[PDB]
Every structure is written in C-alpha cells, then in structure tokens.
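To close the chapter, one final illustration. This time we ask the reader to focus less on the individual chains and more on the assembly as a whole: which components sit near each other, and how the overall shape emerges from the parts.
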Amino acid sequence: QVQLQQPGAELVKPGASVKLSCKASGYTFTSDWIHWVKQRPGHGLEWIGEIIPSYGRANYNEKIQKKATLTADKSSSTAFMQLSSLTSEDSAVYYCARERGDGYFAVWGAGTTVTVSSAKTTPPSVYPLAPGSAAQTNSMVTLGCLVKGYFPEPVTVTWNSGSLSSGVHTFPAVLQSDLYTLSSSVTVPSSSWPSETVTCNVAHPASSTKVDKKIVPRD
Amino acid sequence: DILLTQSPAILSVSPGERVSFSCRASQSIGTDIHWYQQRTNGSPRLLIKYASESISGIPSRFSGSGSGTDFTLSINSVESEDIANYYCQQSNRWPFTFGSGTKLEI
Amino acid sequence: DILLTQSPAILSVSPGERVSFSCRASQSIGTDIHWYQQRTNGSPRLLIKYASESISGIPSRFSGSGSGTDFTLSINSVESEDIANYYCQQSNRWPFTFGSGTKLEI
Amino acid sequence: SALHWRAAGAATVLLVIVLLAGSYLAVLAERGAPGAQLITYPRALWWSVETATTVGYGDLYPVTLWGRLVAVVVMVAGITSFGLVTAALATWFVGREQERAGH
Amino acid sequence: SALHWRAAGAATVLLVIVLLAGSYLAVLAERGAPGAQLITYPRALWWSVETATTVGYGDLYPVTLWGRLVAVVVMVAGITSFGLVTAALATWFVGREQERAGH
Ligand SMILES: CCCCCCCCCO
Ligand SMILES: CCCCCCCCCO
Ligand SMILES: [K+]
Ligand SMILES: [K+]
Ligand SMILES: [K+]
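The assembled structure is written out below.
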C-alpha cells in the first residue's frame, strides 16, 4: 500500500506561501528521515532538505536560495514543507521521500505539482472523441477524450477506472491564454466496442473534481 | 559538495542490447552511490543501492558496478519499459546530491 | 601553500538578481574559507566565516556554501551598496592566504 | 556475585548503550555539516566501536562541535569500561594468589 | 578520602590543564610551519583530546619539533591519567573483595 501520501497540486499567487504535506504509513521508526526533492519541468532532481520527525531537526540545501522550512507532526505522521515568497522559479513537482538513515530513498511520494501564477483555478471540460460516420475500421478502433480549459496542471486521465491501460496515450497539455488542453487516446479491438463500454475518467486535483465521460458511437 | 556527472545525457540503443550508464563523482565516495529510474510523469524508483546491490521487485536485467569515483548502471537486453530517465545519487558526504540524469532511447 | 582562485575577476549583474562568486582552493580545506567585502577606499569587512556562517550586522542577502575545494558566496537580489571587491581567505593550513578578488558590477 | 564482576557486567551493558546512543546522536549532529561522513547509522555504529576501542583506523570521524562532544563520551566510556575489566581481572588474581599462599 | 580517589581526581584536573595548555602551545609552535593544520585553538583543543585518549582518527597532528614535544606530554599525561583511574578502580575492588570475604 502507498507509503507516502502527497496532495496532487497547489496553486500559489506570486509572493504568497504554501505548506506541502507528506503523510507516511507503513513501518515507522524513530530513525527515519523524510526528504524533499524538487523537479522543475524537463529538469533533474534537486535535493531541498531533510527532517528527522522523532527529533524535529531539519537540514537544507545551502547552495540555493532558501525558500523552504521543514516541520513534522509526530501524532499524524505527517511532514511539512513551508515554501514562502514564491516566484515562477518555484513552480515544479516536489517529492517527499523516506530514507531509513542508510543513505538511499527507498520509497517516494507521488509528488505535488506547485504552480505559481496569478491566474484562477478552472476545472476542465471533458468531451468525447468518437469516429465520424464515414470512418472505416480494421481489427482495432481508436477513441478518446478532449480535456480543455483547465488550470493549473495536472490532470490524471484513466480509462474504465484504470482497468484499461494497454493502447493508451495521454498527450502533454498545451498552454494558451492561461488554460491548458490535452487529449487522451485509447485503442481496443473493433469488435469489442460498443458491446463493451469505454469511459475515460478525468481527475483534476486543483479543483477537487473527477468526472467521467462515456464514449458512444455518433448517431 | 560532491558533483555527480552523468554523461552522455541521452543514450540510444537497439532492442535487446546491453546498455551502460555512467556516473562519475568529483571525489572518491567508496560505493555510496544509488540509482533511480524515473519514467514519464512517474516518481523516481530505486533500482540499485550501494553501487551493486539488488532491490526486491527490480528485474535481474539491471546491475551496477564501480567504486571510488566511477560507476556504471547496466541493463542486459534493453526493452521498451526501460525507456526513462536514470539518476545516480551519493550518500558518502553531506549533503546528498544527484547526478544530472541520463535519458534512455530505443 | 594554498592557492585560492577567484574567477571571474569581474562580475556584471542586473539589479535585484541573485549573484554567485566563486572561490576555488588548490587542495581540500574543509570549510575553512572566509569572505570579505571591500568597498572603494574602505577596509575589508568580514561577511561570512567557515563558508556559510553568518556574521552579525551583515544583511541576510549574503550567504555562503561549499566544502572541500569549491566555494561560493551568494547575494540574493543585488543592490547598489553591494558594489565592491570580494575576497576569500583560507585558514586550513599555514600560512593563511587570500584569493585574488572579484569585483561586482551592476 | 562479587562487586568487580558486577561492575564489569554493568560497565559492558552501559558501554553497549553508549555505542548505540552515540551512533544515533552522531548522525543527528553531523548531518547539516558539509563534508561530514559520519551521517548514516550503520557506519556510525562501526565508528562508535572504533571510538570506544581507540583502534583508530581513521576512516571516519566527527567534524562538528556536538559530534565531537559525543565522540568524547564514547571514548571515555570505552576507555573506562576496558580499564574496569582490567581492574576486575586484577582483583580476581590477587584473591586467588592469597588462597594459593595459605592466607 | 582515600588516596586512590584523591590521586584520580587530581589526575583528572591535571589532565584538563594539560589539554588546555597543550592546545594553546600547539598553535604557538605550529604557526610558522608551512602545511601545518594544528593552527586554530578550537581544533587544537579537539586535537589535545584525541591525543590524550590515543583515539587516533588521524585528522590532525603536529609537524614541528615543539609541536611534537607538546604532543608527547599530552599523550603521556593522558595515558597516565587513564592508567591511574584503572589502578584506583582496582584498589577499590580489592578492598571490597576483602570485606565480602570476612578479612
Ligand atoms: C552529548 C549530547 C549531544 C546531543 C547531540 C546534539 C545534536 C543536535 C545538535 O545540532
Ligand atoms: C613543552 C613546551 C614547549 C613550548 C612551546 C614552544 C613554542 C615556541 C617554539 O617556537
Ligand atoms: K590507539
Ligand atoms: K590501555
Ligand atoms: K589512527
């Protein structure tokens, strides 16, 4: 089961601060250290700092402008990272990881996407992508979902609640006029659809929404 | 602090071929190097610890070697699921540091 | 004796930008490096001691990092009063030595 | 049992506790210090053993004030414990020589 | 109090004085010697502790004649002090074993 739980996203206005959380489950020792790692888009992993919850002591990457402050609540097994006075340079995915005091990060959180922007949150509109009436078909058929007008990143798109993974492509979002847009593709044997239902599930963490859109043939 | 250099930044290999990623440390760190795999939009995953120690759940195809300043992560017979970014990380001296990453292309 | 190399000799930065001065030692000196600021016709002024330790009276904008042979003095958001010569100095081995200095230009 | 054996046993148990607490405290003190190597528990425990015994291979050592203070407690605990076992062995021999001599 | 405890206490106080004087004298002797590291008082005091205990991490040591002579006094003071505590512990145990035995 998931050892480290992190919120999917956080939208922050320039100059403001946010507190990321990392809830741990699984074996817990007085000797565990919780680390935080930053990853900007297209870039590598950057170590930010660490904390030992049982004592409350924290250490930080001294080589970079100090934007973080680490704390921990022992009773709820949660570690926190306070990021303050942010700029677009602070926009990135922030991972928390558990180290058993022996040097390597045995397990990682899913990461929290932090977006520093003045723009407002906006849930996505999910539209079906079913073939036109004149489209011919082989042994396989391609369907999809249009996810547009949302902000900020990210969205998680699954097909049939995750049971359908093979034959799936989710394309990177494009930013235009403060809104993102992406589509997801799914391919199943042509014979199996529509007899067998195909639905995409779209989750958008920043707006706390998750919607389903069943894909049916055009009239 | 220890500089971890990963070169080349991109590695192109043909299917089923053995491949080797390089990680070089600015000073001797014994075998205190660990390797992580990160697929698109996924989180890093520990592959090898202390240069050559296996992690349960990781395919036998992966192996590591080296000590001192030069390390290598190898994959016997590369396959599609191996397409990802690979990072090395040291724990010999404080603070821990990461290499710049090598992307695997098939 | 320990050679302390400061390059570049002149650093041009725009107002409000983070800036980093480099100081490299010919051999490992732990964190025994200290930084001084010297404005035109003024005397040197201690800014950072043992690579990263704060001095009372010095603005939070100044910070230091590094250990071994490579050190950095940083200023978050440079401003006019920061225009000066910056020197590093080591106390790891006798005799103490100074770097050649880096001038900051805005 | 006699005092000297009890003190030895106690000293041994106490030494072991200092080695474990010392390994743990050394890591807490040293992380945050650039260049420090005494930063993972397994090698710190090894370090605590080499400190209590004064073997001094030289592969690991504290660079911070508190890491050094912790080191001093481990050294003193180790030197004292081994000194106390010697004193206990001497007491044992002195008593035996008394017996072997008719006193 | 008994002699052995008084000698131990005295030896401890004396050891501490030798550590402090030794740290100070080591810096005086070593500055002026190219390459010397035992040149600031805080690490010299740490050095004096590692010398009196024979721990021998190996991170610091004198390179000059007088720095080495100072080192010898610190070693001998340290070895003797710890040897004297052992002798004091033995005396204590021997006396106690006498009592426990009816003598
Ligand atoms: C002798 C007891 C020392 C406790 C270790 C302190 C660790 C925290 C210092 O930053
Ligand atoms: C044992 C006493 C030695 C005194 C230290 C001498 C320092 C001066 C030598 O140049
Ligand atoms: K020794
Ligand atoms: K001895
Ligand atoms: K030694």
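The radius of gyration of chain A is 21 Å. The CA atoms of residues 36 and 96 of chain A lie 4 Å apart. With these observations in hand, you are ready for the problems at the end of the chapter.
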